[PDB]
Design a protein around this nucleic acid. Structure first.
Ligand SMILES: [Zn+2]
Ligand SMILES: [Zn+2]
Lengths: 148, 108, 82, 85, 99, 94, 99, 83, 109, 93
DNA sequence: ATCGGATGTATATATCTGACACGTGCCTGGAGACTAGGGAGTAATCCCCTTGGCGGTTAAAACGCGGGGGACAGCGCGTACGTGCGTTTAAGCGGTGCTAGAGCTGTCTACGACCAATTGAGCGGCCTCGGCACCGGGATTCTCGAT
DNA sequence: ATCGAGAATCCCGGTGCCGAGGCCGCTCAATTGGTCGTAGACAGCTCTAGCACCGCTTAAACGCACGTACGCGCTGTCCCCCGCGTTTTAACCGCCAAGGGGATTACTCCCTAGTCTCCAGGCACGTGTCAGATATATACATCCGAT
């Protein structure tokens, strides 16, 4: 139906000019389910890591936001163990003009600097606010075993 | 909506769902209060506030001012068919009256 | 003690109120009738205000008592509380 | 002047403007997209998030939602795409 | 030789002037004295917050302006332009204030 | 210090910064807005209470608030306001 | 030779007769049909209790009687005895029904 | 089972009787249409609230209590039918 | 008082004090209800009912009848001053209206 | 069936107090029932609002007295206050 | 100023019918005794804002005057509405038949009140810089007596 | 139909001030997790009254004709508000000083909610009889034309 044309336009625009360090595609036969992979940003404690996530398109698109969930495990103040992400673009301030490229870029930029104003995991956010060295060490310890 | 966040953000509102729930529950309105009532009431209140604020902002812009004063509120309320009907008996302090001179009184 | 303060509502004040109300020409007996009706309205409001104050075991008539009285009579006022 | 085809594109459906309505924030989108967002979303501008609830109410009862000048210019300079759209 | 306006063209000027402003038209001190007199008639040895007096003044002025609008309509109905006490009485009776 | 008094000033300013991102508001206008919000809250919550009492119920649900909004809002406003509330509920459960 | 009353006596006779009785002055079937038509306009497939229709008729008749009293006062104000639509409109406006 | 222009059932003699009860001696010829319009407006306003009340209770027949509640909400209390 | 008879009889009234207490408690007015409020409310209601019934009985006796009908109630309410103000917005079913004719409409002498 | 409560018998008792000879029809009883219910609702609502304003949580006799003063006109309010005070004094001892 | 028709309303008498007043069975709601805890009364203290006064200066009110426009009364016209009579229409009453839907009852499952620990949203207080108020000069526009 | 002089109002530029908006600290109320008693959702059955139709009166509605009296326009008189100038009065603003009462806190006690048991007061149902409505026949008030 109508959302389908938006999906083909999204896929074409992603294929012609792929973004940096990320790549998304249709995991299944239907166009609703997508799989995406992201490479750790260069100026971050996630060096060398590659991460997988799933994108679920609602039956009502683009006027309702999609839902993204991390497949792997990540040590970040804004992400739980099950992959839930606390991003205002996905829930609080979603607009139809936004594209999956923008939300993926925002997710990538989250790893550059975590948001401590509204952390989804208060404890590790408080740990990060305590000392940067301990947060860096624990993030590296998690990523050399989970990401790779 | 997924939990583990403030109630006013799950519904997408700006008005406080929790305060409205407390006022409904402690206001001697009913023995019990449903879980969806505060959300509905807060949404309605926010809609009305946004409507009147937009009309008052237009009225203030028409007067070259960048600050809403009660005169602009009166102008916005009394120039609308429905808000005037809703706020019929309500008196706005220092709001004045709309300019209206009867056609008979004008010079011929 | 005070006496005969209704004459403080002078002729120019009533003329100004009429002009704001959209009146082009005023007769000469309007002023006494206006003073009488204003006095009746003030008595009606102040009676309820004083009753509200007396119930609260107070000695000052707060603005909120006036707001409550006006709301009771059907003259809701915005700006002074509530 | 004449707007180019690059800037004559609806941002939501990525197609040519069809009865383009212009919001008070000077953002223009085609009528089906605007109606869909009004009836199915938060009733704001999808580009800069400025709610137009009172404006939408006041202009939906007079059928003045659609901008006429821009629509005429689009229909005159680009008549080919409208038929297939 | 001195310039004088025709009777009626200064009244409309004041109508336009006073319908555009928002201040209070009755003086403060006489109204406060009248309110205090009525209150002491009701209960003796009372005190007033300034906001209470201001609220009373605003309510009284709004009521008087509305009554004058209705009185003007009543006067125009009878094919006149002056407002007379019978207009006020009829408006009050129809509004239900005295029946 | 003075005891804490609650008001809708912060939320009213947050809403104002949405319709007009470059327009301020005076203190007296906020005092009028807060009174208007309180008055409408009281009206709706009293009408819903009476409506629930009529049918011998004990709970104030979203249905009662919707019917109260239908009853005491004039015409088009109701047709819009109801809708908004509905959407909020639909966005709160899921 | 035939006897007939001057215009005005029969009107006062009817005024005295209808102010002493208490019955309903509108026939039941046409009012019931009008009420049912309006209700059908609002929501289709409705059934009406007889008490509901009777209450509606009583309320409507009382409202119309009060409106006609106010109309008569408005007409008498303008030095007349006939009541005209402008009297009804003025009575409705001053009462605040339509503002 | 639709109905058309039943407001003509409020005949001129009925309006004359209502005016006589109200205390009117001489009546113009254009009162009847204005009175019909006023009655139509009043009936619509009351019946809308009555139907809302009967819809909230998940019923299909309007009761006298719904009419009484609607009248009380509009500000016209009625005695003799309950409440 | 004796603290031995029924509550209404102890208070000296005929309106029910227990029913008024229950209606105040279950009516969603306040969290708590005092012990003397129902007595006051019942006394006020009984006084008002007695006044209206006495006036209606007088109006019915003036019409050579031994039964109060809504017409007598309407006459009693309207002919009074305080009661008419208290029930200004109230409509009495089958009550009619007070008879009056304006002086202008009367025939010329 | 279901039982419906009403003030019929008390109204009849008061009527027999004031006018031992006169009777009363059914419609008059319905009108008096409606009147009593309306006055009950008015006074109770005013008393509840008064208690809420003063940051209280109970409805005593003084709230009812002030509500009666606020609602009823002058002479009626004075007589009602006198009757209520008399009843409270007689009941409390 | 009455006088005689002529009409309509008020008054007295028989009668008969259905609605008001009272009696009975019972069951559900009100009364009586007991307990616990939280709400409200009472005493003490702080400090905020309400009252009272004095001096100046000046915007606003009171007084007086010329007169022009509007309120009010009187006449004439003619048309719309009141009154009465013959005709046609549909309301009102009675009686019967059918069933949709209001009303009550039994199960039970999911929604909402209560309780305890925790912490972040929002309220109180401070500070500053720009929006609005004010002043002074100039340009624009209704107004009116005279052509 | 208009030209021009006196007067009120709107624009524009410069200066100053105070309060609106943003930030910091903190306390308390909203959030989260779990438990448990109960309300209302739902299915089922009963039986009340709302709806539909038909036949017969006769009462209210309708249409038409005649006349008169009241609404409306027009003219005229006069008198009372209006616009303007001058003088008197007190409102408004800033300042100081006192203390009355509003607002907060702590302690305690007693008053009311909750529970259980018991029984009688009011509600539904049924029945008798007389208050009042109706029909019929006089008595009198009142309206209208004509002397
Ligand atoms: Zn589009
Ligand atoms: Zn925009």
């Amino acid at each position: 139906h109508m959302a389908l044309k938006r999906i083909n336009k999204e896929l074409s625009d992603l294929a012609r000019d792929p973004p940096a360090q990320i790549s998304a595609g249709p995991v299944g036969d239907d166009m609703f389910h997508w799989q995406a992979t992201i490479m750790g940003p260069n100026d971050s404690p996630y060096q060398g890591g590659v991460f997988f996530l799933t994108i679920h398109f609602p039956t009502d698109y683009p006027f309702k936001p999609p839902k993204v969930a991390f497949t792997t495990r990540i040590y970040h103040p804004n992400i739980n163990s099950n992959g839930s992400i606390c991003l205002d673009i996905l829930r609080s301030q979603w607009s139809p003009a936004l594209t999956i490229s923008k939300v993926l870029l925002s997710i990538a930029s989250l790893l550059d600097d975590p948001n401590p104003d509204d952390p989804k995991v208060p404890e590790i956010a408080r740990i990060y606010k305590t000392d940067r060295d301990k947060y860096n060490r624990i993030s590296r310890e998690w990523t050399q075993k989970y990401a790779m | 909506s997924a939990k583990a966040c403030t109630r006013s953000s799950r519904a997408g509102l700006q008005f406080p769902v929790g305060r409205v729930h407390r006022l409904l529950r402690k206001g001697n309105y009913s023995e019990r209060v449903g879980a969806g009532a505060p959300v509905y009431l807060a949404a309605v209140l926010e809609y009305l506030t946004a409507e009147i604020l937009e009309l008052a902002g237009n009225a203030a812009r028409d007067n070259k001012k960048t600050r809403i004063i009660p005169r602009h509120l009166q102008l916005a309320i009394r120039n609308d068919e429905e808000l005037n009907k809703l706020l019929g008996r309500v008196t706005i302090a220092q709001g004045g009256v709309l300019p209206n001179i009867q056609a008979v009184l004008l010079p011929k | 003690v005070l006496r005969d303060n209704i004459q403080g509502i002078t002729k120019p004040a009533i003329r100004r109120l009429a002009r704001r109300g959209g009146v082009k020409r005023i007769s000469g007996l309007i002023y006494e009738e206006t003073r009488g009706v204003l006095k009746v309205f003030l008595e009606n409001v102040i009676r309820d205000a004083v009753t509200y104050t007396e119930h609260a075991k107070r000695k000052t008539v707060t603005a909120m008592d006036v707001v409550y009285a006006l709301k009771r009579q059907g003259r809701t006022l915005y700006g002074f509380g509530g | 002047a004449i707007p180019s085809l690059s800037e004559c594109q609806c941002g939501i459906c990525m197609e040519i403007l069809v009865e383009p309505v212009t919001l008070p924030c000077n953002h223009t989108l085609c009528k089906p997209c605007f109606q869909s967002t009004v009836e199915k979303a938060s009733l704001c501008c999808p580009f800069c998030r400025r709610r137009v609830s009172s404006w939408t109410r006041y202009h939906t009862r007079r059928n003045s939602l659609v901008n006429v000048e821009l629509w005429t210019i689009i229909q005159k300079h680009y008549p080919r795409e409208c038929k297939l759209r | 030789k001195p310039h004088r306006y025709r009777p009626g063209t200064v009244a409309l000027r004041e109508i336009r002037r006073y319908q555009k402003s928002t201040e209070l038209l009755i003086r403060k001190l006489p109204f406060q004295r009248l309110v205090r007199e009525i209150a002491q008639d009701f209960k003796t040895d009372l005190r007033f917050q300034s906001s209470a007096v201001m609220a009373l003044q605003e309510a009284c002025e709004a009521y008087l302006v509305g009554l004058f609008e209705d009185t003007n309509l009543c006067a125009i109905h009878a094919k006149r332009v002056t407002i007379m006490p019978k207009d006020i009485q009829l408006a009050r009776r129809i509004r239900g204030e005295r029946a | 210090k003075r005891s804490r008094k609650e008001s809708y000033s912060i939320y009213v300013y947050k809403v104002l910064k949405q319709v007009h991102p470059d327009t301020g508001i005076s203190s007296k206008a906020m005092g009028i807005m807060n009174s208007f919000v309180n008055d409408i809250f009281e009206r709706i919550a009293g009408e819903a209470s009476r409506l629930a009492h009529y049918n011998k119920r004990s709970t104030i649900t979203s249905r009662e608030i919707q019917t109260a909004v239908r009853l005491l809002l004039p015409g088009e406003l109701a047709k819009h306001a109801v809708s908004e509330g509905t959407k909020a509920v639909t966005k709160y459960t899921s």
